[PDB]
Subunit: 230 residues, 4 copies
């Protein structure tokens, strides 16, 4: 059975993604940085739906630790068919007021996270010889920019460029690579045409569609789920 890793899936959008992918018939491996009991509850929900699940704990910024954990996980459970890079981080503030930590933690969590998680998993995915799915979570801020978010806009825009480039490299192996860019999600309203925040499942549904076999001709794309914001 095809297995998908979802980062930051103990709560929020990542949890909704994990549950929808399980309902669609994937085995789903849960991940969190620190909330272990929260991760175990999601694992139990996925098992209740009739799929296999377990969780992995790591900080996506810990390059060597992430490599070791994922290498061992692939050895024990096989390569991942899909990877959803959902975990990210903000440190909002006017640009001249941003601290070194405000900048670096935001940039690294998204972009180091992309490299650190995907580098150990590309070859195990290719070796499944059945295509694959990679979906990154960006933001409307990565497309348009946002005041107080020069760091977050840069990190989420960088994720878009990484996604498009990797789509080109992996297309020959039938691995699609796409990005989902949420707007304002429940986990400003009078700029949103639909006049409300989005719900976590409204984001997860797009990720689930892209991970489905039906989405086989979609790659290199940024799909905005933002109530019409842009």
């Amino acid at each position: 059975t095809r297995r998908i890793l979802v980062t930051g899936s103990s709560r929020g959008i990542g949890k909704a993604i994990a549950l929808q992918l399980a309902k669609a018939g994937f085995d789903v491996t849960v991940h969190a940085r620190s909330r272990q009991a929260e991760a175990e509850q999601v694992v139990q929900e996925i098992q209740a739906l009739g799929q296999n699940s377990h969780y992995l704990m790591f900080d996506v910024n810990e390059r060597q630790t992430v490599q070791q954990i994922l290498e061992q996980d692939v050895e024990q459970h096989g390569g991942f068919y899909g990877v959803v890079l959902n975990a990210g981080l903000t440190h909002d503030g006017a640009f001249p007021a941003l601290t070194d930590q405000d900048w670096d933690e935001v940039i690294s969590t998204s972009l180091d996270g992309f490299y650190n998680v995907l580098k150990p998993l590309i070859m195990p995915m290719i070796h499944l010889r059945k295509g694959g799915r990679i979906v990154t979570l960006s933001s409307v801020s990565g497309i348009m920019g946002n005041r107080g978010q020069v760091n977050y806009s840069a990190a989420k825009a960088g994720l878009i460029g990484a996604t498009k480039a990797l789509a080109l490299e992996l297309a020959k192996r039938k691995i699609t690579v796409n990005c989902v860019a949420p707007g304002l999600i429940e986990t400003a309203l009078k700029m949103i045409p639909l006049q409300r925040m989005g719900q976590v499942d409204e984001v997860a549904s797009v990720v689930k569609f892209l991970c489905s076999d039906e989405a086989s001709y979609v790659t290199r794309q940024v799909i905005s789920v933002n109530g019409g914001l842009i």
Copy 2:
């Protein structure tokens, strides 16, 4: 039961959309310019899939005839919950050698088709008081331009602009309005990252997703289904 009109649905991408929407549980009204027997075959297939169907015949450029047929159809069968605008013609050629007919028929079929089909249907959709779905079919040529298709690129780009503007007007009614832009599809290669033409169902699947209740926070969007071309 919610009913969706799909223009140009007797064959090709439009037929695949009609059949996918029927499998999803919508009643589907078929449309064709002239191929009556082909349209009736799709109607019979939708009925075999367990939904209600009939067909409507009209040239989308015939403004008054379209209005009469659609107003009569809404009177007999109720307003449409969804409309999929699959209305397009090519007349390729170098721009200075395009004839008046090459230009006008390509512009009108897409842009007059949008006005002629949707104007009689917006208020019947709103009066359902249950939201709604409008999906237009553009093209990669509408996003990027293409040699020999100044007319078609203009028409399909114009469709994108009309789609985004209508999304803003109808958002308060919970009617999403989106555009699907296919690349090179089998019904029409070293440039396509996936190294193959798309299949009609690979386009129809994206239209079907957008028409689903799950896609409720996606509006004002152009989703490309092009194997990575752009």
Copy 3:
């Protein structure tokens, strides 16, 4: 001397473009739909700047008239090195409420204007054997859409697609083809609704001046812009 046609150049943005191009050293041919005296005033200002000018009168929708006038003008004065297409009108309203004319006149003025004006001029431009410049004027509404302007957003988006496709056909001729998409500009006829909605969303918190648009067109028409083609350049104060 290289000659550039600017449509709708008797007032507003089009006049600002014509004057900036004359100052840059181009001969500039003025055009207007109906206000002949207004057009003649711009001609006189261009002549006073030291370049050749005259004006042409036509509705850009009258296809055969446009062709006859333009072919006669090219016979008398030579091919145009540049064409700036400044053509379009608004007929705002909610989509269910748009009349047939509200829709058709907005679509045709932008898109038939493109075909009607440029089709007779491409080969005379090519025959100059010195490259060329085509700049179309779209709008921020053609990029992102706008309430009450389903017709206008479609017309100006279609202008973008036509521009990009033509850029591909003419690139080997060293003719660049680009689009300038203004946001909310002084002298542009806009509803109070559209003007209020725009002002709250513009980061620079003001309307643009006509010369802030004309300067971008002037730059694209310069020899320096020779590697810029197929582009839509937004001049909108940060709106998008």
Copy 4:
């Protein structure tokens, strides 16, 4: 009354062309290089021969504290910069599975930490000039659409676009425009005959761009005439996209 602009990586190539065009437009221009000091001094003398004031600054844009100290000392001695052009960047090409840690980290940091390290000490001195300002970043067509063998560079140059757009929003009220120029294939980029051959078939103009064709766009955005252009990515790519 004279306005001064810093151009990173201006001892050669596109950055040099930008510096010389800005000098010809009437700005004083401060040259920068990571290590090629003699090369930077040659550009300084050309700017001086063009009729403007110039000197050079040497630093790796990744050396955050060294950059802060050099820029704060420069502003104390010569006044705030009216403009900053972030041209210096770095590639380390290779398929994503082939990339080393250094290949990834050096490319991401040079563009994105370079943005922070150079601009953070300069934003307030720019604002305190009370006469607007100009910031232009140099991205790449790869940052817009991605490129095989450049997952790292595509990420770095796409991130630069997000930073540019966000900063434009913050600084608009100070009449500082913030824009990005995204070159295509330019004559300074070393490519094999095979790669060049393939690339030329994809570019509608069917040739590489010249350094001045890029610099002209930067020079326009830095001009007073470009006062209503902000938050934009302007592609200079011969029609590639």
